[PDB]
Symmetry: D2
Subunit: 394 residues, 4 copies
């Protein structure tokens, strides 16, 4: 307000496929990569950062405070506090909102906010301290257990997605159409070089030495409805299923970051920002339909901004499932030509902790590239939440 918080820089790694191009790279090295890069791009010295805040969901086995590791690995001094927040899929966006708060209230001057996740590296879990006298014991998958299973209904996110498909009447055919659209938009954007600016290469040691990874791995080029309609429903196999692997996102690795400060601090430094942050909201809804979280979230953020929905030029609405993104667009009555125009997570992938910031990074570069003005990033969150941010291009 008058001196709003602005985003000066924004970058992401490619999104790697499960057990794919980024699987050997610890999550904190993904974090370091984007942290170092956004500072570079903003021309901000690492010692001028007030704090680092990252979303990060599946942190088992990553060592003590992996954000701090990521921060220091980027060349930020030990003097700079660094910490993580978890709000499942919303975690990466929540990190940025939290920065908005510390800067707005006058506690931080410059913040590197973001999200990070290496799901390929998520371990299996065993409780061994008591000691099992006799009987089988599970090695539980932390991804499933901590990432993808609703704690209230003990069901996969994909089941909640079927609830939304049912209730918002998004057919199998609808979902496959959204999926094809998402895949084709991503392929068009890739070929047109639309992601080049936002991507920062990741360094990976191979048997044939060091390599740069700089193409998103998860897209399935040549996606078509005929192929997709042959697949069987994955979560719900009693003949009422609609969600398949083709119309859902995946398990993925990646990180993203943004540099934030006040407009006045940007002016003082001779920086022109990507955008100003106008508003944001977090809301709660029923776990059984967590997918529709962004509906109340968007309506509140947009309202808080003094906007009507028509005023929004571009939406990024996390595409965890076609069933959910379709339902959100249908209920709000959004123009699909304004929503996920470079494609969404069905094509690009969904590294839980990173996605909130990743879609923001994309949003901001899309707005910039198209010379459009007003954007909304939003995500549904397991357990029944939604988060949304309003940004306006300077």
């Amino acid at each position: 307000g008058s001196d709003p918080v602005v985003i000066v820089s924004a970058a992401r790694t490619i999104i790697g496929s499960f057990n794919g191009a980024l699987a050997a790279v610890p999550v904190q090295d993904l974090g370091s990569t984007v942290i170092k890069e956004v500072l570079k791009r903003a021309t901000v010295a690492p010692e001028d950062v007030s704090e680092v805040i990252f979303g990060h969901v599946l942190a088992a086995g990553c060592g003590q405070n992996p954000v701090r590791q990521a921060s220091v690995g980027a060349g930020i001094p030990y003097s700079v506090p660094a910490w993580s927040c978890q709000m499942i899929c919303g975690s990466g966006l929540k990190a940025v909102c939290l920065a908005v708060q510390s800067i707005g209230i006058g506690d931080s001057s410059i913040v590197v906010a973001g999200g990070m996740e290496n799901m390929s590296k998520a371990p299996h879990l065993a409780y061994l301290r008591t000691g099992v006298k006799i009987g089988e014991m599970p090695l539980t998958d932390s991804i499933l257990c901590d990432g993808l299973t609703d704690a209230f209904h003990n069901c996969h996110m994909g089941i909640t997605a079927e609830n939304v498909a049912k209730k918002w009447q998004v057919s199998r055919e609808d979902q496959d159409k959204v999926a094809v659209l998402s895949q084709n938009r991503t392929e068009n954007a890739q070929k047109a070089g639309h992601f080049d600016k936002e991507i920062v290469p990741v360094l990976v040691s191979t048997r044939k030495g060091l390599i740069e990874v700089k193409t998103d791995e998860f897209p399935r080029h040549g996606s078509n409805i005929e192929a997709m309609s042959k697949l069987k429903p994955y979560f719900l196999t009693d003949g009422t299923g609609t969600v398949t692997p083709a119309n859902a996102s995946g398990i993925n690795d990646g990180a993203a970051a943004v540099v934030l400060m006040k407009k006045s601090e940007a002016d003082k430094r001779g920086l022109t920002p990507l955008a100003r942050i106008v508003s944001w909201s977090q809301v709660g809804v029923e776990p059984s339909i967590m997918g529709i979280g962004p509906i109340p979230a968007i309506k509140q953020a947009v309202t808080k901004a003094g906007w009507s929905l028509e005023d929004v030029d571009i939406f990024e609405i996390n595409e965890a499932f076609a069933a959910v993104s379709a339902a959100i667009v249908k209920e709000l009555g959004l123009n699909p030509e304004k929503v996920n125009i470079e494609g969404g997570a069905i094509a690009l992938g969904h590294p839980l902790g990173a996605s909130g910031c990743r879609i923001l990074v994309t949003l901001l570069h899309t707005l910039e590239r198209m010379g459009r003005s007003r954007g909304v990033a939003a995500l549904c969150i397991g357990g029944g939440m939604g988060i949304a941010m309003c940004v306006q291009r300077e």
Copy 2:
């Protein structure tokens, strides 16, 4: 400022011993217990909570967003956003600072902040996705890996404690004296009923049915220097060791919570708060001496409050190791009769995610009970950080 953020209520579970009285209780049930109770005590209806923020470090195997589970298990509606932060030992206090920020900036009206940890339930970890063709594979202890091992030097917190012992010249004899003091102060406080008010019983099913757990489990009554001086150093066994199990805290389970709102909202509701929050700080230091984090943290918080150190009536300085707490007190020149007067974590235990808020809960009730005015809660943090808060009794 003019309308400061106040703490209306504050409560904790007992602290359970490793694999002890609370080990069968999932961490989110510990959270629910304290959340429900602080609302009860503040007379605030659960549907009036703007959000829930909890510190939580070892979240592997706890399911999707265990704070949200804890929130809902306390009777807070699905409409109320709930999420976690991780800043190792500082996590529980960081949760409260974050609430201060959301309330200060006008985003939240009422917040339940806190921390929670069941270390007994922390699993072992195995990476099984690639597949090991031939050879041994570790089942890594998440407590050690993610909780207690410095990521920069690959050494136990207890090793960093020896660095501080060495550098601040805190002898074995000094450490054992601090340990005895801590144990005796805790035993005196227990017998005098000083913890009765702050403790909320935990419900536990046993073979002989339901029981209430309401005594802290970890204290070793009759602690004496003669016994302690017989023990061997645990981390550093080359004849230069000082830290033993008797002069370090433990692995422990527990939770704690506070209810926060603006002074004006408290006045409107006819509530008298425990205290107002005057200031807080987070700082970074070298990982090798993470223990001395609270020195810069305290100095900055106290300075920001407009106080001198003499102005502080009561300190709670987390007693992870006698070596560290002694070093902090020595360097700042604090009166030991003002520091951890009900005893500290050597006697009480250290459930990582909970401790930041737990010491705050104790602080506030001590200030209340003694009719003293100004308090400081502070903790060192693995990886090289410190966090401190200033509170003033209304």
Copy 3:
């Protein structure tokens, strides 16, 4: 025949309770203990042993050829071949029959035969070579998996025991009576010192140094029908159950051994043997009723010996379940005062690989102590087999 194979010496360790007195002792050290001891007792130099043959069922994690380890640990040279056989519960007796064959045919001159098992040390199992992309994986209990589960019907031995109880009409009351009898006979034998001769102490390091273990651990003195009839059926909980923990044996650790050679070699050496081996049999039956294996086994061995059943003075019939031992005795019409007179495995325990030889050791010492002449050792075997041996006291 004319120059029959004789048993010169026979010894056993105590039988340890699951996770009890012998759990820290590797199975091969149990083997070494009994091997060394029987050589000592027979006055046979270790370098005169032709070969060592031991039954051993649960060998996972025991290292390369644990019989060979056991042999060498007893002071038998590297020049002496040593190897194991597996025939589940019959394994320890099968080892002795196999020795009878190598000596009878003229391939071996002196053989140490026996059985050994540390079930406390049996590991859990995980298949990790492929690599599990996503999902839970079992840590399977090798005891259950490889020891106690019928491979044909995928059911616990205790289920097959219920089949025999049903079909041979052995009531819950019958089973509990057999159990009390077994417990009381064992307690009487212990107090009378009847096991003193056959037991060889095991050496175990404790925190208070080295100790000798020389009392069987599993017996429940003061066993009574009133207590037993209060227990619930363990395997079959649909209201048709009869088998409980009180009328079944346990999971147990132990070893036993015997020294064998021809009568002529014994005469040459100035040794008087415990007994001569007269006959033995191995038979197959249906897995669903594996418990009744000893019926055809005994009938064939006794027939091969030229005996009638009345001619047998003493039987040892492995008491895996009261339901099975009762059924065997009922069908064959045996005098219960001739069967398991020092008690059986319900009281003493059942270390799978050892039991076949353990009951033989006991048989031989009982025959000796009572001055009786003709004995039968027999066991049922998981998967549907029976094994029996006839011995005659010289």
Copy 4:
């Protein structure tokens, strides 16, 4: 003697590569395949089998008595006893010797003897019964632990192989030459169809349905010394190494079986056997040089047969390591044109429990195919043993 034991039939599966063509096939199904087939070939009804004896080393996770499972899966009745022996690498040959003994002494009339191993399916091991309060725990590889590690010196078989290389002066160049020879002989035999008769196809379900596997998988066609001499020593990397993957065998899956009875029983049935068994030996040597076990073993078997070494037309000497097979041939002064003429385990692979019988199967078919008369099968055994058999073609 006068009525010697004869082998009527002999068959093997292909040998599968680690995690290769047979990895999804449980070991007992490999057993059933060869058991059923040898009965078929001998024209012996399954109900006429007196007993089944198989070598089997890595039995963890295979269920109760996997030989019995294998027997019944081949259509052998429940009435036929079936059991396993373990003598590490010698296990498959020991099974046959044991049959010789039961038939020779008049206890069995017809025996199916053999060996079987699925090393791909060998699990990792964890001891979980006590309960680990705090710290890392190993998931131990049962292959390494129970199969490939000398229990006396705690070193890989490959280390003992280096001891033999050193002591018998078998150079790196020598070993690579033996390896190339073995690979080229196997490739020549394959192309000439020499294994066709002995191989029995294994049935495997694939995504594209059922398939027959009938080519040995492990051979590396086009093996050459130039390639081999580029490899680095695998076990001993201090610059004194000679053993590499190219001049050692592998980890492999397979089974083999033979049908045995007396010559008189063969005559009565109108069967002409492959060969008569003339003699066999088992011996012990120092674990550090277990590889040279076959030297004393062969000398004793050949001596017991009334043969000189020149009398042996064909040897099969298990080729665990070129270093060992070379050393055996050098010391005994054998013609390399008489030794492993279809190639050995360097090319064919080494499924521990199966190999003893596998080389016997090959021996017998080679003797038959070449119209040669006298053969020797022999193997070294971990822990310091050797086993050898003499056969003579009828």
